[PDB]
Amino acid sequence: TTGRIVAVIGAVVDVQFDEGLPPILNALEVQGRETRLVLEVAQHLGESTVRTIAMDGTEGLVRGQKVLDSGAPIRIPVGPETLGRIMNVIGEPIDERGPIKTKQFAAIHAEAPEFVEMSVEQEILVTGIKVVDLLAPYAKGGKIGLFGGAGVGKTVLIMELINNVAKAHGGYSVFAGVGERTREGNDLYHEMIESGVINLKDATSKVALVYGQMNEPPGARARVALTGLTVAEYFRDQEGQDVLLFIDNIFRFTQAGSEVSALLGRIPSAVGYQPTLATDMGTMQERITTTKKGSITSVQAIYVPADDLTDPAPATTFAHLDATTVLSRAIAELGIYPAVDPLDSTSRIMDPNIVGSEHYDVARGVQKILQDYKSLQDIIAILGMDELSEEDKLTVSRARKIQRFLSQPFQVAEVFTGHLGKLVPLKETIKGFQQILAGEYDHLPEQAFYMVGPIEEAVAKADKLAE
Amino acid sequence: TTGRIVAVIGAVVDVQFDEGLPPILNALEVQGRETRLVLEVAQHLGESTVRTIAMDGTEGLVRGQKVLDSGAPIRIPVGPETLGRIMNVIGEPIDERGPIKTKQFAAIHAEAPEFVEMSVEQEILVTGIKVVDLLAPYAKGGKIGLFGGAGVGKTVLIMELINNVAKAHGGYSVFAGVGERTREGNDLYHEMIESGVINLKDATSKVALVYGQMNEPPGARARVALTGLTVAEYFRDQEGQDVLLFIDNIFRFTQAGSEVSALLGRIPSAVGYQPTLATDMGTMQERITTTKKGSITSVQAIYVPADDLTDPAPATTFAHLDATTVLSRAIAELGIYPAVDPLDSTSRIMDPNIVGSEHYDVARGVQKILQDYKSLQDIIAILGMDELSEEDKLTVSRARKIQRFLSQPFQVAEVFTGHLGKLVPLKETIKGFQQILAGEYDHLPEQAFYMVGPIEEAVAKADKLA
Amino acid sequence: DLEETGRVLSIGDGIARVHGLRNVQAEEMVEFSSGLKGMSLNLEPDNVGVVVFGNDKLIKEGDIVKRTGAIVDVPVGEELLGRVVDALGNAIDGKGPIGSKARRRVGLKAPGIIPRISVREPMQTGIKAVDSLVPIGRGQRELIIGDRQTGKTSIAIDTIINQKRFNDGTDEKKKLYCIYVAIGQKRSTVAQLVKRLTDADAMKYTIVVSATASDAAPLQYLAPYSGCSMGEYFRDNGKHALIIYDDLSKQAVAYRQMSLLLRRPPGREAYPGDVFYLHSRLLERAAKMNDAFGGGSLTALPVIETQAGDVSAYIPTNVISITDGQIFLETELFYKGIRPAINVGLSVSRVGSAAQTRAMKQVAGTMKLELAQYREVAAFAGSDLDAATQQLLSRGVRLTELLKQGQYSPMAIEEQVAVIYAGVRGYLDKLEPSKITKFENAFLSHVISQHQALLGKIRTDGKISEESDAKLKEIVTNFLAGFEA
Ligand SMILES: Nc1ncnc2c1ncn2[C@@H]1O[C@H](COP(=O)(O)OP(=O)(O)O)[C@@H](O)[C@H]1O
Ligand SMILES: Nc1ncnc2c1ncn2[C@@H]1O[C@H](COP(=O)(O)OP(=O)(O)O)[C@@H](O)[C@H]1O
Ligand SMILES: Nc1ncnc2c1ncn2[C@@H]1O[C@H](COP(=O)(O)OP(=O)(O)O)[C@@H](O)[C@H]1O
Ligand SMILES: [Mg+2]
Ligand SMILES: [Mg+2]
Ligand SMILES: [Mg+2]
């Protein structure tokens, strides 16, 4: 069926159909264009007119231009032929490698898996990162979200999660680039070619790429997150196998929605966001889940606007997650990396009957002495170190050593910390902090625990500071 | 040719024309009014209807009343025979001295001088005021701004700057009263008659006055700044002679613009302001400038809403200035006059290459110790000055003496104080602060530096307290 | 003929509602009866909303509007070097016509993933605190943020002046062409800015794109994109260019006016919903290309002005999330003597040491944490501190004094390393903090006049040699004891 454009206001395009009107969420093809332009039906305005959002720039559009209804929502290539390839919002290759050869496609809009399809199975997975493994562990097929304001390390953290977790995985991974830096797209692509996770000559590629960065218009950014997870939905359901999904950044999904909300004819909500903020996230996130058919382990980098965690975008995102990793600017400013807040990160599988009573008690013990140190920090700010009791400066020295032992060099951050990165086993992580809490290393210097691997490296560094 | 009123609300009046529509900015004459009522065309609404803004009260207007196009924008008297006269928005004399018979007329709207017309001359203008000359000195042919909230001393400062500079400046001066006190205009007029800078008997008059005060509707206040500006423009170009332009207060331009914007059917900007705030100010401010042809040394008093310097009105003004003088309420309430904030007043000529290496270093020394003193303020209020170290106590005593030596008795404030007005040369201002910074008057009491002229009077005041 | 021409229905506040123009494209340039240009941004069923590139007194109801059949473009090439142009690329310096042989569209989209490569070339500013702690690379986006009069423009200016050393040389991939975009400033300030660049002999490689305060909002809106396309020419022809948007704060203000008067609903701080996309699509166009595309680059230095340090505001929070790093400036530090007023703790650069010469990496590598250890103990201290924590305070204070720097004297990288060396190796730990600034002046001029062979070897070798490390140590220790007396 053929329709005509009647209005163009930014990303919002109104199209008139004289006969059969296309249902909401359909993909419309604009005619007389050099590159393929898709308009997604958002509203039925009435009087045989629909309101759409453009998936690319609306420059060069004329009132009365032919627009064809494809009959179905935006459909993308799915299957093992997405591995090693970079796709965009509408399923076009952007790696210059040619057409995605496949006779299997899927709509990027779908119903969220039902309540009966949910799995209560919780199993701890080792990540190699001490702070995460110890305090807020991730679960197999769990929903992980990495919070943080600008420049605290969301990208660096998610980058090393792909560097560590994908190794301990025989299945496929999906990385959705949502409204972030095209530069980092080039960074991740060539790093994975180097690491061999993407192979440009054979079929051993294990990571599928979907990209729609911040040079793309709002419409593209609003739906490129759904394009990413639809590829993940195929590997989970139609195979029944374990899948890994990484998103940087899922805040951009919400941002893009607010960018068009005014022009769609909505009254603005609190803090300038769209009224639909919660349900938009709902019908999106509820698709990102482990089912009885298969398992998705999801990691989502989440921007915190002006590092305010009360902001509606990040604040509504907490309820969707099983494990939360909250990054802090004050902890980043000290030089502690990762800048994970030990007193603001949860895990749910943090239970004596899950991770063990030994694991749980060390985690709470580390948290207790750091919380008590915070109240002691309020004293030494005004009166100084000389005022503290012998019991007090014993806990301070231990707390300061624990702060540094939570930090480790990453294997994707060679240029920042100077020395190479290393992976720390879980059993060595529990033992390490356990030893410091007992006071076994009250004789060792403070900087011996800074940016090291296991506790054995801290002992070796203590000798190296002398001569 | 003839128009008809179809809509009236506040200063915004709609006129419909049968044939021949007046271009935007055209002055229209309302018929049936006892006094002249000028409507300025702002928008073409369509269907042969224009949206206009009045320059006087719109009470007593009827739907169907006739309006005539003048053919041009608002035109005012310009030239040497405006000196010593007072006029309103539309260039009508308001001094009861008769018609202003000028050979030339000029429209109050004009395009700002092009980039090729700009001069790069930067030369120091000694004001005789300590805070100004030392820290943020004004430039000849430069743009000066005086920021401040309600009652901190914007008007008192601009009046002292008239007294210090206008006498030693052999040229013409223009004062534009914008949305301020009418009795201040009366005081300025008769004082100038008393002194002789304005003459009713002779053509020796050196100052031209333009007034549209806070008793006028928004239309008048929004445009009156251009009327005084156009007078100043003529003297710059078609003579070559140097001009001083004093405006009190330029905020009233933008404020009046906010009042009419609510009635022009605009969607409001932030803080309820007009969406065209920066561009309205832009096309207006860029006319106040020195060219290759002539020089304008402009001083503008700038009101600050609720003491908030982040308010869109004062905040946008900063980029149109070459030297800023920000007044503080807290500094005013401590008894410091002028209430100049030493750490928020700036100048583009505050540079060792321009003012000298000794001038610059002392200025930055004064500022360093005052910022060091400001950092301790919390601990001083909780514990006390006696709990400070010997290093800190020394900076505190010196900084407190520097604070007071920054204050100065003004000639305009000869009644408000009862003291004598003081005019201090630049070299003596630099020397004064330099000695306190090096620790030469550490033994002397604080109050000796309070409200004095040069450094010598601080010593002479201390002798009486001995 | 209502398909190619239109008729003005209403005109006010730079907005013309036009009836007709049935074949006009979105974002197409149209011409008015009086010759004035306008851009079609609103395409409604009954009208076209056109933003006006100038005064609207010359536009009346019933005026005829004509199609040009093209989007906006600007002149491009090395003929623009030394010239001051407006938003459309028309010369305003009065020095004649731009003899440009090429044109380029202003709305061209950024290079994708493929045509890019990792940032690997140093973009030297000449400012010690920048080149050491916030290093910029060629193709990077680095924000300059802070309140009014904190020194923002001056960072950009000193960076431009510093390039003379590279542009006077023979090495061509070492070169950098500068583009200063002035948005919403006054003409006298711009002319005083050009005078400053002319005296430093910096104009001959600098393009000045100026849409000032008297220019219409669409002129201010378009100016950044115009200068970007001028930079993109160098980027796409195996050359390296640096653009400076001064500032994107005033551009957003201009765009808000347009959007509000086109009757598009306001959001946070009255700004339109797409104000983020305004700056994102601009700064994404800064890139470092791979060798198949020329190996050229475009580095962007956006400027943002905050209000009373409010980094939480709508506009600043957008640009911080866009860029690869920020340089934070504060008035408190400025008046404390810390000039440039760079807050080291708040300032970062995501590219990092990969944007530094091998020499600067050796000295600045430790500085970051060493200063972080200092700031921790700074707001932690007269209750008397132990020998260890007093040492950390001493070191930090002395390194901070070295990060101080005057204006218009951008330093070469070998001269920077030498002065950082003396502080970072503790050779100034027991020196009175007031004379560190005095030390640096006399120490550097002695190394400049009597030790050119040392600096020359650090410059050419690109690192601190074992022999150079020994020689630096020899000079600093003996100079120390002479200065101390
Ligand atoms: N330099 C000064 N010396 C003495 N008193 C002053 C001075 N500046 C201001 N004042 C006091 O403040 C009052 C208000 O000053 P004014 O200039 O009218 O404030 P503004 O114009 O900012 O509203 C004056 O009546 C005067 O008593
Ligand atoms: N490193 C420096 N040393 C001394 N003065 C400086 C330095 N950097 C800037 N300034 C001064 O600070 C003032 C404001 O600088 P500017 O760059 O105009 O600030 P902004 O661009 O933030 O408004 C200028 O007069 C300039 O001379
Ligand atoms: N693990 C780490 N080790 C060292 N530095 C880090 C680490 N993570 C982040 N950083 C620092 O923080 C900067 C910002 O990292 P990024 O991941 O881009 O933050 P975000 O994604 O939250 O904006 C990096 O350039 C680096 O200097
Ligand atoms: Mg990131
Ligand atoms: Mg007043
Ligand atoms: Mg500036």
CATH number at residue C49: 2.40.30.20
CB-CB contact of B240 with B294 (8 Å): yes
C-alpha–C-alpha distance, residues C65 and C22, integer Å: 12
Q: Is B153 labelled a binding residue?
A: yes
Data resolution in angstroms: 2.6
C-alpha–C-alpha distance, residues A48 and A46, integer Å: 5
CA separation, residue B370 to residues A203, A205, B376, C32 (Å): 69, 64, 10, 58
CA A207, distance to chain mean position in Å, is: 15
Number of alpha carbons in the 13 Å side-chain half-sphere of residue A280: 22
C192 and C229 assigned to the same domain: yes
Distance B109 CA to ligand 1 centre (A): 34
Write out residues 365-384 of C within 8 Å (CB-CB) of A.
365, 368-369, 372-373, 375-376, 379-381, 383-384
Using the beta-carbon criterion (under 8 Å), do A385 and C385 form an inter-chain contact? yes
Q: Is A151 labelled a binding residue?
A: yes
Q: How many domains does chain C have?
A: 3
Using the beta-carbon criterion (under 8 Å), do B51 and C12 form an inter-chain contact? yes
3-state secondary structure (DSSP) of residue A269? coil
CATH number of domain containing C413: 1.20.150.20
C458 and C334 assigned to the same domain: no
Catalytic residue among A40, A160, A180, A259: A180
C-alpha–C-alpha distance, residues C34 and C36, integer Å: 6
Q: Which residue of C has its CA nearest to B368?
A: C336
Q: Which residues pair with residue A39 across a beta bridge?
A: A28, A54
User: Which of A347, A303, A354 is closest to A323 using CA atoms?
Assistant: A347
Ligand nearest to the CA of B328: 1
Distance A151 CA to ligand 3 centre (A): 6
C-alpha–C-alpha distance, residues A159 and A187, integer Å: 10
C-alpha–C-alpha distance, residues A133 and A406, integer Å: 10
B371 at C interface, C-beta within 8 A: yes
C-alpha–C-alpha distance, residues A155 and A339, integer Å: 12
3-state secondary structure (DSSP) of residue B294? coil
CATH number of domain containing C78: 3.40.50.300
Q: Report the C-alpha dihedral over residues B190, B195, B200, B202, rounded to 10 degrees.
A: -170
- The architecture (CATH level 2) of A1-73 comes to Beta Barrel (2.40)
Number of alpha carbons in the 13 Å side-chain half-sphere of residue A129: 27
Q: Is A152 labelled a binding residue?
A: yes
Which method, experimentally, gave rise to this model? X-ray
C145 and C273 assigned to the same domain: yes
Cβ count within 10 A of residue A234? 23
CA separation, residue B162 to residues A108, A207, B325, B411 (Å): 72, 75, 15, 11
C346 and C363 assigned to the same domain: no
**What DSSP state is assigned to residue A345?**
-
C-alpha–C-alpha distance, residues C167 and C233, integer Å: 18
Mutant choice from A183, A251, A307 vs C, greatest count of C C-beta within 10 A = A183
Residue C471 near ligand 3, beta carbon < 6 Å: no
Return residues with CB closer than 5 A to ligand 5 (ion).
B 155
> CATH classification of A74-349 is 3.40.50.300, yes or no?
yes
CB-CB contact of C302 with C141 (8 Å): yes
Q: Which residues pair with residue A355 across a beta bridge?
A: none
Residue nearest to atom 15 of ligand 3 (CA): A153
Using the beta-carbon criterion (under 8 Å), do A334 and C376 form an inter-chain contact? yes
Write out residues 432-451 of C within 8 Å (CB-CB) of A.
none
Residues 6 or more apart whose Cβ sits within 8 Å of residue B316? B277, B278, B281, C253
d(CA B185, nearest CA chain C) in Å:
31
CA separation, residue C1 to residues C6, C8, C63 (Å): 8, 14, 14
Candidate from C43, C117, C326 with C-beta closest to A186? C117
Using the beta-carbon criterion (under 8 Å), do C113 and A186 form an inter-chain contact? yes
Q: Which residue of C has its CA nearest to B286?
A: C214
Pocket of ligand 1 (CB under 6 A): B 148, 150-156, 337-338, 410, 413, 416-417
C-alpha–C-alpha distance, residues B192 and B185, integer Å: 11
Q: Where are the domains of chain B?
A: 1-73, 74-349, 350-466
C-alpha–C-alpha distance, residues C194 and C92, integer Å: 12
Catalytic residue among A4, A66, A181, A461: A181
Mapping DSSP onto H, E and C, the string for chain C reads CCCCEEEEEEEECCEEEEEECCCCECCCEEECCCCCEEEEEEECCCCEEEEECCCCCCCCCCCEEEECCCCCEEEECHHHCCCEECCCCCECCCCCCCCCCEEEECCCCCCCCCCECCCCCECCCCCHHHHHHCCCECCCECEEEECCCCCHHHHHHHHHHHCHHHHCCCCCCCCCEEEEEEECCCHHHHHHHHHHHHHCCCHHHEEEEEECCCCCHHHHHHHHHHHHHHHHHHHCCCCEEEEEEECHHHHHHHHHHHHHHCCCCCCHHHCCCCHHHHHHHHHCCCCEECHHHCCCEEEEEEEEECCCCCCCCHHHHHHHHHCCEEEEECHHHHHCCCCCCECCCCCEECCHHHHCCHHHHHHHHHHHHHHHHHHHHHCCCCCCCCHHHHHHHHHHHHHHHHCCCCCCCCCCHHHHHHHHHHHHCCCCCCCCHHHHHHHHHHHHHHHHHHCHHHHHHHHHHCCCCHHHHHHHHHHHHHHHHHHHC
User: Which of C50, C31, C24, C72 is closest to A62 using CA atoms?
Assistant: C24
C-alpha–C-alpha distance, residues C247 and C251, integer Å: 7
- The answer to whether A180 is a known catalytic residue is yes
Distance B157 CA to ligand 1 centre (A): 8
Catalytic residue among B154, B221, B287, B398: B154
Backbone φ, ψ for residue A221 (5° rounding): -70, -30
Q: Of C70, C95, C121, which residue constitutes the final position of a domain?
A: C70
B376 at C interface, C-beta within 8 A: no
Cβ count within 10 A of residue B439? 11
A380 at C interface, C-beta within 8 A: yes
Residue nearest to atom 11 of ligand 3 (CA): A153
Q: Which residue of C has its CA nearest to A272?
A: C268
Residues 6 or more apart whose Cβ sits within 8 Å of residue A350? A135, A136, A137, A360, A363
Distance B232 CA to ligand 1 centre (A): 27
Place of tokens 């994970």: A340
Helices C466-484/C436-450 angle, 10° precision: 130
Chains that touch B (3 or more CB pairs under 8 A): C
Pocket of ligand 2 (CB under 6 A): B 348, 350-351; C 146, 148-154, 339-340, 405-407
Distance A194 CA to ligand 4 centre (A): 21
Chains that touch C (3 or more CB pairs under 8 A): A, B
Place of tokens 């629909």: A50
C348 and C374 assigned to the same domain: no
Using the beta-carbon criterion (under 8 Å), do A183 and C389 form an inter-chain contact? no
User: Which of A35, A17, A268, A299 is closest to A159 using CA atoms?
Assistant: A299
C402 and C379 assigned to the same domain: yes
C55 and C197 assigned to the same domain: no
C42 at A interface, C-beta within 8 A: yes
C353 at A interface, C-beta within 8 A: yes
Which CATH class name applies to B350-466?
mainly alpha
Helix extents (H) in A322-452: 329-334, 357-377, 390-405, 414-417, 426-438
Distance B134 CA to ligand 1 centre (A): 21
Write out residues 177-196 of B within 8 Å (CB-CB) of C.
none
Please report the DSSP string for A429-464 in residue order. HHHHHHHHHHTTTSSS-GGGSTT-SSHHHHHHHHHH
C-alpha–C-alpha distance, residues A355 and C437, integer Å: 57
C116 at A interface, C-beta within 8 A: yes
What range defines the domain where residue C400 resides? 357-485
Mutant choice from B115, B116, B390 vs C, greatest count of C C-beta within 10 A = B115
C366 and C311 assigned to the same domain: no
- The answer to whether B329 is a known catalytic residue is no
**What DSSP state is assigned to residue B93?**
B
User: Which of B318, B286, B284, B283 is closest to B302 using CA atoms?
Assistant: B318
Class of residue C382 by CB neighbours under 10 A (exposed 0-12, middle 13-18, buried 19+): exposed
Using the beta-carbon criterion (under 8 Å), do B120 and C195 form an inter-chain contact? yes
Tokens of C163: 């390039």
CB-CB contact of B278 with B320 (8 Å): no
CB-CB contact of B146 with B162 (8 Å): no
The number of the ligand 3 atom at minimal distance from the alpha carbon of A410 is 1
